[PDB]
Ligand binder design. Structure first.
Ligand SMILES: NC(=O)C1=CN([C@@H]2O[C@H](COP(=O)(O)OP(=O)(O)OC[C@H]3O[C@@H](n4cnc5c(N)ncnc54)[C@H](OP(=O)(O)O)[C@@H]3O)[C@@H](O)[C@H]2O)C=CC1
Ligand SMILES: NC(=O)C1=CN([C@@H]2O[C@H](COP(=O)(O)OP(=O)(O)OC[C@H]3O[C@@H](n4cnc5c(N)ncnc54)[C@H](OP(=O)(O)O)[C@@H]3O)[C@@H](O)[C@H]2O)C=CC1
Ligand SMILES: O=C(O)CCC(=O)C(=O)O
Ligand SMILES: O=C(O)CCC(=O)C(=O)O
Ligand SMILES: [Ca+2]
Ligand SMILES: [Ca+2]
Lengths: 410, 410
């Protein structure tokens, strides 16, 4: 009978397939009925991006930068096949790469633990956080094929040939056809990455591990290991020793293994690509991709981009296309909204907003924890192949709706 | 009371730290006593590589190329810390990066399965086989630091400006200091990697998944996806449909997640860097890094390099250095030997050797399976912290020696 007035505007980026269905239903029954928010809509569906020539993604990202908070829905990243499917103009770049490259920062990811649910990696009991660097490397590289024999070279030409000097490093000499590419990153980005990773370790009282491959990419990865170590000793080694938490660099090999056999409970900082890949493993490993939150934070600490860790769940969308029933977990999507709404509230000092968010969350999880109403993904975790063990994609969302309404009378 | 003559010679590459110590005992107590082998030795310790200016590495690589079979102990790949520890000249490149780059091929790694021993990803019940592309990408890249503002271009100059034309892509425009890198790979190499993969899928009658990140590196990762598919239909899809196995390319993100929640029982052809990182996850997932074999197979199928998949085990070596007890798993190391002897045998039609290999493996595994003698990692796998559950590095090794004697009388 009353609505919470949200101060500043929230930027919303709509997506594709299964996740677009879930999204809408979420803001219809779970968000709009309770909030007086000014949503600045941006449709990032393939058809929208195509028609707009990906320009909209530029606009969306710059909207987020402006207003501070963004809630993004899963989106189809066009690969040859996709182009055929939607008869696209170009084979557009992942909008996630464009946004992330525009905003910068780290993408913090961690599973949503529902006690009632088992775990694929049983020994894991305490949440594992992934601090994926969002800025460069291969999500902003320059790949290209190489026709026939010739020389490959990476060339650098300074602006002021007085403080530095040119470089022409011979990369290879093809004797046949193949591929090549080059990527990059900056000291500025890595430093923010480090600052954001040390802060979260301190804020959550968890040990921090930076994983790299510095024994191979001696200079490249070495810059990561070194800046981290520099910043640490510079202004965290104090609060860390005082908190009982340690920072340590390890080789990615050792770390992913150390993790697979641990009880979870620590922060893993990784380069973009590793943050990307491993986050999925952690996700799937704690239960299902349906139970992992994701949020990009800028070094500022005043800009956010909330999203689910998974994709558009195409495989499930395909079933939905042919009148077949679906059991897609919407929990990450709900949290994508709640966590977005949370940062919105802290930024504007609107505790009414933050409270609602925790209620949204508390009700979403309890519908599983308490009432035992879960989708197929979580059902297979408990060990029940039986169809009568789970509910549909819409049935679940309705149960969350119902329990939310109850938990709002208190 | 008799020795097995080994027709052709075996190239042996000694290495560092705890693995060097294990290595020695293996050959003194398990290989030399039963074989008449012309072992073409090559000490690849850090010191032996430093004084030799890493040339020995080159020599060893080329020796394996010549005599067909090489067996390697784990080596230290120097980084800044190492240069200061052993007071080295240069920060030498990984001798594994150097060997693989010279032999080419695919590195097939899978877990060594010990029934009594549990698994960290219980749902896994059938061996997962990694097919790591051994040739290029970041394991033969070129990186450097960017001092200050300037351009960064990927310059390509073909030899015959008729069949192909130069390229000069603009990678980035630094507005500050950062890092830059560039890597490559050849279509020829990829064809080999693809062929090898498939053949293995058939021989072992298992599904073949190729993972990639083409949505991001459309040209680079795309090539892998394409050449793979081209080869499939070009000469395998026949035998596949016939056997009931299905090849298939998926996004890395997906494959790692599928894998984690699967029951296992498939082959994951991965790109070099991925093959590296995933194989550790997989090995640790099945029990411990110590229970996993790794062997390089050149495109020919007539050149091999057996090795353990793990490193030199510094943390343990450190304990040893100060007169403390050790519990390092030697199974990987021993199989590096056996798998190499076996490979030598299938090439010199020496069924006598192939018999020793299998009995060696047999006894190595039954020491754990039957007699219940194992190292601390396998004890904890079983869930027993109690000191009395495992035995020292040397202790375990002696047990394999003793049981080896027995099982040989038959
Ligand atoms: N950040 C973003 O916007 C991203 C977008 N994408 C895009 O999404 C599309 C599909 O990508 P894909 O490789 O399938 O990755 P997905 O995240 O869509 O993975 C789907 C697979 O994992 C399972 N899964 C994933 N999410 C859920 C969920 N919420 N509930 C239940 N199960 C789930 C599905 O279940 P099951 O095993 O039963 O089939 C299926 O196997 C592509 O266009 C891709 O580019 C991909 C990644 C990130
Ligand atoms: N192919 C090669 O020659 C390789 C060489 N290296 C080199 O090895 C050195 C050490 O690298 P590092 O990061 O420690 O990687 P390691 O392979 O040495 O990993 C050691 C870690 O994993 C565990 N572990 C690994 N192997 C075993 C084993 N056989 N038995 C029991 N436990 C094991 C150890 O257990 P615990 O948790 O108790 O410490 C330790 O945590 C470095 O110089 C690295 O460059 C690295 C990779 C490959
Ligand atoms: O941009 C994309 O295609 C999705 C990348 C991805 O897997 C993720 O952000 O989780
Ligand atoms: O070369 C190195 O440092 C080790 C690389 C590695 O992890 C492997 O060969 O499995
Ligand atoms: Ca991902
Ligand atoms: Ca490895």
């Amino acid at each position: 009978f009353s609505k919470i007035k949200v101060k500043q505007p929230v930027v919303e980026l709509d997506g594709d397939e299964m996740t677009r269905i879930i999204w809408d239903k979420i803001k219809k029954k779970l968000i709009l009925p309770y909030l007086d928010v000014d949503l600045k809509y941006y449709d990032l569906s393939v058809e929208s991006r195509d028609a707009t020539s990906d320009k909209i993604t530029q606009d969306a990202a710059e909207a987020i930068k402006k207003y501070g908070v963004g809630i993004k829905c899963a989106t189809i990243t066009p690969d040859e096949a996709r182009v055929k499917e939607f008869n696209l103009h170009k084979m557009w770049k992942s909008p996630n790469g464009t946004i992330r490259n525009i905003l910068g920062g780290t993408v913090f990811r961690e599973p949503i633990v529902i006690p009632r649910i088992p775990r694929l990696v049983p020994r894991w009991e305490k949440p594992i956080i992934i601090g994926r660097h969002a800025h460069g490397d291969q999500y902003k590289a320059t790949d290209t094929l190489i026709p026939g024999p010739g020389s490959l070279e990476l060339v650098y030409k300074p602006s002021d040939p007085t403080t530095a000097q040119p470089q022409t490093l011979k990369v290879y000499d093809y004797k046949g056809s193949g591929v090549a590419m080059a990527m990059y990153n900056t000291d500025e980005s890595i430093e923010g990455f480090a600052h954001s990773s040390f802060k979260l370790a301190i804020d959550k009282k968890l040990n921090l591990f930076l994983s790299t491959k510095n024994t191979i990419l001696k200079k490249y990865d070495g810059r990561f290991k070194d800046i981290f170590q520099e910043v640490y000793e510079a202004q965290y080694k104090s609060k860390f020793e005082q908190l009982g938490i340690h920072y340590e660099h390890r080789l990615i090999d050792d770390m992913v293994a150390q993790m697979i056999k641990s009880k979870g409970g620590f922060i893993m900082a990784l380069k973009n690509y590793d943050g990307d890949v491993q986050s999925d493993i952690v996700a799937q490993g704690f239960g299902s991709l349906g139970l992992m939150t994701s949020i990009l934070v800028t070094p500022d600490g005043k800009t956010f981009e909330s999203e689910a860790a998974h994709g558009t769940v195409t495989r499930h969308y395909r079933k939905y296309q042919k009148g077949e029933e679906t059991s897609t977990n919407s929990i990450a999507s709900i949290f994508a909204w709640s966590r977005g709404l949370l940062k919105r509230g802290e930024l504007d000092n609107t505790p009414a907003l933050c409270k609602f968010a925790n209620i949204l969350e508390s009700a979403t999880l309890n519908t599983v924890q308490q009432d035992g109403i879960m989708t197929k993904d979580l059902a297979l975790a408990c060990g029940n192949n039986e169809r009568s063990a789970y509910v549909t994609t819409e049935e679940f969302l309705d149960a969350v709706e119902k329990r939310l309404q109850k938990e709002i009378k208190s």
